[PDB]
Amino acid sequence: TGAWIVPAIMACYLLVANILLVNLLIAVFNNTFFEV
Amino acid sequence: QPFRSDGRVIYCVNIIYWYIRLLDIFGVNKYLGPYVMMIGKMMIDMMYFVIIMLVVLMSFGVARQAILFPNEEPSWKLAKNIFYMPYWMIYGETGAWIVPAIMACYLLVANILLVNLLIAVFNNTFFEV
Amino acid sequence: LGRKIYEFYNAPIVKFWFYTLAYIGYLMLFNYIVLVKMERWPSTQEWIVISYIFTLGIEKMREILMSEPGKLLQKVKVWLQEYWNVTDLIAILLFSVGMILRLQDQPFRSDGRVIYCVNIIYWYIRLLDIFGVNKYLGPYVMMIGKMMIDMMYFVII
Ligand SMILES: CC(C)CCC[C@@H](C)[C@H]1CC[C@H]2[C@@H]3CC=C4C[C@@H](OC(=O)CCC(=O)O)CC[C@]4(C)[C@H]3CC[C@]12C
Ligand SMILES: CC(C)CCC[C@@H](C)[C@H]1CC[C@H]2[C@@H]3CC=C4C[C@@H](OC(=O)CCC(=O)O)CC[C@]4(C)[C@H]3CC[C@]12C
Ligand SMILES: CC(C)CCC[C@@H](C)[C@H]1CC[C@H]2[C@@H]3CC=C4C[C@@H](OC(=O)CCC(=O)O)CC[C@]4(C)[C@H]3CC[C@]12C
Ligand SMILES: Cc1cc(NC(=O)[C@H](c2ccccc2)N2CCCc3ccccc32)no1
Numbered sequence A: 001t002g003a004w005i006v007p008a009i010m011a012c013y014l015l016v017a018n019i020l021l022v023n024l025l026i027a028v029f030n031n032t033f034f035e036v
Numbered sequence B: 001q002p003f004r005s006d007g008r009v010i011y012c013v014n015i016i017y018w019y020i021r022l023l024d025i026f027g028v029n030k031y032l033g034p035y036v037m038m039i040g041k042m043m044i045d046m047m048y049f050v051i052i053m054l055v056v057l058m059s060f061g062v063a064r065q066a067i068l069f070p071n072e073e074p075s076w077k078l079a080k081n082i083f084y085m086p087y088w089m090i091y092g093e094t095g096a097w098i099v100p101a102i103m104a105c106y107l108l109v110a111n112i113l114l115v116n117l118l119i120a121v122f123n124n125t126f127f128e129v
Numbered sequence C: 001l002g003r004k005i006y007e008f009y010n011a012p013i014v015k016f017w018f019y020t021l022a023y024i025g026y027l028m029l030f031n032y033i034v035l036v037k038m039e040r041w042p043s044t045q046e047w048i049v050i051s052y053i054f055t056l057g058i059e060k061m062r063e064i065l066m067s068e069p070g071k072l073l074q075k076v077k078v079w080l081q082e083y084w085n086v087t088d089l090i091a092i093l094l095f096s097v098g099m100i101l102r103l104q105d106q107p108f109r110s111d112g113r114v115i116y117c118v119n120i121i122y123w124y125i126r127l128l129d130i131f132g133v134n135k136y137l138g139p140y141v142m143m144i145g146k147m148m149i150d151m152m153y154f155v156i157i
Helices: A004-014 A022-036 B003-020 B022-026 B033-066 B077-082 B098-109 B115-126 C002-009 C012-035 C046-067 C073-080 C083-103 C110-124 C127-133 C136-157
Strands: none
Touching: A022 B115, A022 C136, B003 B022, B022 B033, B033 B077, B033 B098, B033 B115, B033 C012, B033 C110, B033 C127, B033 C136, B098 C073, B098 C110, C002 C012, C012 C046, C012 C110, C012 C127, C046 C073, C046 C083, C083 C110, C110 C127, C127 C136
């Protein structure tokens, strides 16, 4: 009936877990290259 | 036989070079030539990266092989384990907490440091050529 | 000929290459004593690693004694201002604790083996300080140094 709160959790997990934070990390480690 | 299998293996390792040899021709293409020279610079860059990658990675691998499987007899299969098992350790898993610190540092320094260092290195080498 | 030998072996580059060949041998013997069996009494390959750690401890004591300031606490603080000296001392007391636990019977031998297995990690990481001098590896070592602080601030988020 209302078993749809869980796929929203997996959907936000896929949205913010790798696809945000990992690309933030290559961006951070790319900016620190030329400064040193 | 069994020298026919050795000749087949030598043919099978020669076809690799006879495919790699096409990069010298590709070196003349206005769009492939920069990529061939980029492979040429990235070979030296990855060669210098490989020492730090080994120092980071096979030390843990030795740590995993000395924490787990504590009864491995002296044989040459130990070296094959310590540079084959951590190569495929993606799917692998009172005071029994020293091991999760090892996995935690492994996840911290193995991919999430060295791989991003590698896209950073290969991104800096783009505009210079 | 003796003057030539003494002039060769007192050179700093010769000392550096001799010292890193002795490390490479130390890493080899430490890998051997963490992969092969370990009994009530240590083998030759483990007594060599024990003697390695004890002679470095004596060398670090000579670094404590033979330095520039005259006060003992002042020269101790000056030597401990460098982070690598701190982690080297931490590894020396860690190895002596692991050896003392290993010299006892079971289950303390497993604890000594675990302490050896966590000390080999630092004794591989210590090579980054040497790599810091390579014209091509030194930038990468400093990049690891900045990326440690960057990943530490990233880890909270
Ligand atoms: C840090 C990087 C650059 C190199 C790491 C090298 C190690 C992975 C090697 C170097 C010394 C090797 C050991 C040297 C000697 C032996 C004995 C060998 O057994 C025999 O030769 C049987 C006969 C006998 O000696 O009794 C089995 C492999 C083993 C443990 C080797 C396992 C792999 C080791 C630890
Ligand atoms: C900077 C330098 C000191 C690095 C080079 C290290 C070598 C000088 C060491 C490392 C491994 C050592 C060996 C490790 C084990 C043995 C076996 C040991 O013999 C036994 O234990 C029983 C007899 C046997 O079966 O050999 C005799 C010494 C020997 C050859 C050692 C001789 C000295 C070696 C070659
Ligand atoms: C000059 C720099 C690059 C250092 C070179 C170090 C090597 C000369 C050492 C380091 C590890 C040593 C090995 C470590 C352990 C063993 C096992 C040892 O065999 C045993 O302990 C089993 C019993 C037996 O002796 O038969 C024989 C010597 C050997 C191969 C050693 C031979 C000498 C090695 C290769
Ligand atoms: C045990 C053990 C450790 C070790 N090596 C060092 O920890 C280090 C070193 C590391 C790599 C290459 C060369 C030397 N080293 C040895 C002597 C004391 C000392 C002083 C200042 C800086 C380095 C250094 N050898 O056996």
